Design a protein around this nucleic acid. Sequence first.
RNA 1: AGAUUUGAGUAUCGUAAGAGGACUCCCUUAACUUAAGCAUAUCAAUAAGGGAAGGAAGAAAAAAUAACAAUGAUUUCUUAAGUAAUGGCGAAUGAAAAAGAAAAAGACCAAGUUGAUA
RNA 2: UGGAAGUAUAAAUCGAAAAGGUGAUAGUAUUCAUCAAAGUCUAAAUAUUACAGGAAAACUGAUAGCAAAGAAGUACUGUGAA
RNA 3: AAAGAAUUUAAAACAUAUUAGAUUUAUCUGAUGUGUGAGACCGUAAGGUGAUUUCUAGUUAAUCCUUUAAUAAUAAGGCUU
Lengths: 148, 204, 54, 89, 266
Amino acid sequence: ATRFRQTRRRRGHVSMGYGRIGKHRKQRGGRGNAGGQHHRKTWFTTFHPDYFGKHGMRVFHLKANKYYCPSINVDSLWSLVGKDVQAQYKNAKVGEEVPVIDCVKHGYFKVLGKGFLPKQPVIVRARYFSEKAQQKIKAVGGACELTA
Amino acid sequence: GAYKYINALNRKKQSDVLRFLRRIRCWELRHLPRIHRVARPTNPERARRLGYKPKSGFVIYSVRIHRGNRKVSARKGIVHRKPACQGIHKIKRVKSLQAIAEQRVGKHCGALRVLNSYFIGQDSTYRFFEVILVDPFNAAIRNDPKMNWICADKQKRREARGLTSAAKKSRGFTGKGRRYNKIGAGARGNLKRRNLLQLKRYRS
Amino acid sequence: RKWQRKTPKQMRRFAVASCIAASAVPALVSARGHHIAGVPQIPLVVNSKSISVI
Amino acid sequence: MAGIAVGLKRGYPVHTMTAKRHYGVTKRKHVVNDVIREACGFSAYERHMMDLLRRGLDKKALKYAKKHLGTHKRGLAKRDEIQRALEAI
Amino acid sequence: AVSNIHFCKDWRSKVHTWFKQPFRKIRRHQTRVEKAKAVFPATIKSLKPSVHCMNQRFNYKLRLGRGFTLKELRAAKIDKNLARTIGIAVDPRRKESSKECLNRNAQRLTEYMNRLVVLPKVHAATAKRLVLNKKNAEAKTKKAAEIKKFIAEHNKTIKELKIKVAAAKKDYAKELKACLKGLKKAQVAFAAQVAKKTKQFNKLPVQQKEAKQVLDANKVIRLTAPCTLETKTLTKGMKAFDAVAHLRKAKNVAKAVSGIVKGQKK
RNA sequence: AGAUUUGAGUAUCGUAAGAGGACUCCCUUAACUUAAGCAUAUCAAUAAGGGAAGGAAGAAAAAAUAACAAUGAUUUCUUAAGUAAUGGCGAAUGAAAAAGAAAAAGACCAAGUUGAUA
RNA sequence: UGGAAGUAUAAAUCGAAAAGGUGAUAGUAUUCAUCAAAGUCUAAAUAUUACAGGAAAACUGAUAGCAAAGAAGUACUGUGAA
RNA sequence: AAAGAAUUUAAAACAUAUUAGAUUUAUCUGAUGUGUGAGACCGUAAGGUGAUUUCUAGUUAAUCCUUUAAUAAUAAGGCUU
């Protein structure tokens, strides 16, 4: 909407809101990130203080698929099957059927341990596990399974 | 067969037999005109591999080209350029001398089709090739289901567009894969496609 | 230039539902410029049998 | 129940299935090689390698072979190919 | 924020605008319809394998590939010279990756051949194949009389056990320990008895039927059956199994091969 | 004299040229500009100069990816992605496998064999 | 060239094979994986502001819109390119 | 010393043996064969056995990270000063 711009409100003002002493000229210190070390050094120091330099080792061809590992905490495990199933198997223990949570089938590879699990036995199947993830699953009365 | 020994023999180009015969051939081609027809290929093994068939409509032309390197054509070696482009010597052609000689033959005989070419010999000054040419309007070539692809209009001046093996090698079409990312299906077409700024109809 | 504008689907469906609801308010229907003084019901429905013969 | 995703014994349990086909020559390639070799002979660097091999400088014959071929493995094959000609004579 | 905008070149000659998009749909759809009218089983989008995706990021998913390998055609008893003529993709470039891939795509082809209805090459009722089917029809009646005696006397000890499992599971859903053990014990015995020669090629289903025209066979034969909620019985072994040390032992085994090789040469 | 090889003149039947070049395939070592100077870099396969094509052209059937529960000619679109990387590591430049679709199609020479050989 | 101890092309010199290439950090070795270069053709999906024929438009309405709504690349200028 | 079933039928690479042909060269070309490479534990008797993992005690080896199929000795790159 060009009728809501400031140009329509500054009609009649000579300088169009840019100043009489310091005019609106072509440039204001260079094109792009010019003067990163000379006159805009106070800008880069203030707002991007690690912009110039080198850090870490180069990876000539990075295989970004090798780092792909979606994670889910323990407290979020039961949301994969829903609350209806969670309450249905609420009073299970060793010996009878217990629901299996297929983390991989839902797109989660690693299971981390954060928050608190509901006090029901459960079988967790995933590719990777954390030390506290397995502790919390086992302390509730469940098991851990590997995949792939 | 006879041609499985000729091919084996022709890889020993540093033998005294082949070195002597190439000396006689290269001397003879230094006096004959630059581009001229020969009755039969001097390397029938290599000619047959590249597509030559001893039938009507196939002719062989010999072209002599001055090998080596040349200067940048600037008057008295003066260029009003920055020091990054101020080099007159040491600058190499992009097209191979085989591809350059193919265009000279094709230009000379504009009514024939350059099928392929191979290498005959070289001396301290020249390099000699032979070019397989096919007449597209021959009743024998037209009626051959395996060769009338040369009668298509798009094959007019094959070597100038860059469709022959010699001219395609200088285009980068010598392989496939991550080594040839920039020469996928045409080096200049690939650059245009990657540089296209797509502005969809409904964009944010 | 930018001719067409994007809009989220759930916002588009919100507007149609709000526009359908207003079509059943006789005050809003007439205030828009429609003569609906004589119609029996403001959510006017006709038989599917009568429609099939037209 | 599913394998494991880390280690040497890594992967989902399946029965993975190809023949390492050898690209070789026939017994007639020896006849062709001997026919061509007699009709042609040895190159300048092949002759120089024969002289070094006779004097017992195997390492210098490999360094010379690598110089004219550029590959360590191809320099070895030429050295062994030449030394099989010396034992024939 | 430091800006990185690559508009320093002539983007005005690099701008591609999509004003032809609403007419690509009409072009492609109309040509797609034109193909169906011309010869319908060409736009049929000939049958394709079920091949896994690559890399560990996707390897649990299935997707259509290109062409059935020559070993999968032999297992399904189809000639590769006839496969391309009846809407089957064939890819000799595909190496067999696993037995399970070989079995899964063998089921796909067999199921496709059952749903397939090949019309006679010549529409006349005097076609040689139609005549030949009449000639050997009486032989099929004799042969099919033996195909039914078999697979009615051999798969009978497991059928009752298989029936009992369904009934016992139905009763449980209203035991399974001994019910499933009996079926398992028979299955190993059955697998021990098969260890003998089957026809190289099956027959092409050829007949005369009213043409029901289906635009693709890939959406009829689904890649993956719908996933339900898998449920398992908790045992003491499942509780005991400590998965973290299995992960860390497996990692440390692979990272100690350097130490093994270094210590050998010393 | 005769048998061949090679090279010419003439005759017959045809072939190339020139126009156009928006899109297509290429040859060539521009500079203005940016870097608040400037000399590598950027502008930039960009301007101009030159050649060759068709209704489309280019490419196309792995000496290809990957390290997987693995794929499988080419082309084009989405995403990867302003990411890996390149760079007075400054200004700036910058892909591709995977994955999702449109369309789908594979065949030949050379070499080898058959030679009362055609 | 994004390709970094060399991704591609070309030139000078050199130059293989009882094969071999690739796995992008140079080197040697042993395994593994995957292909089999140095000849050719191949429709479909794709591009288009030459030009011709059409249809549309929140476009301009005679100092606007093509330079040109009339015998417009016309009248007129230049030796000429223009 | 303490807990520990391990998932379930369509298969090819060839390390080979043993034969049917051809060859002399740096020799090859078919087929038959076992293992390899295989994984359904014995229970209606409580459940034992048993791969594989844990803790403690000596032993020999490696040990800052990377060169993206796995290692090695050279080389190169990272991190701190």
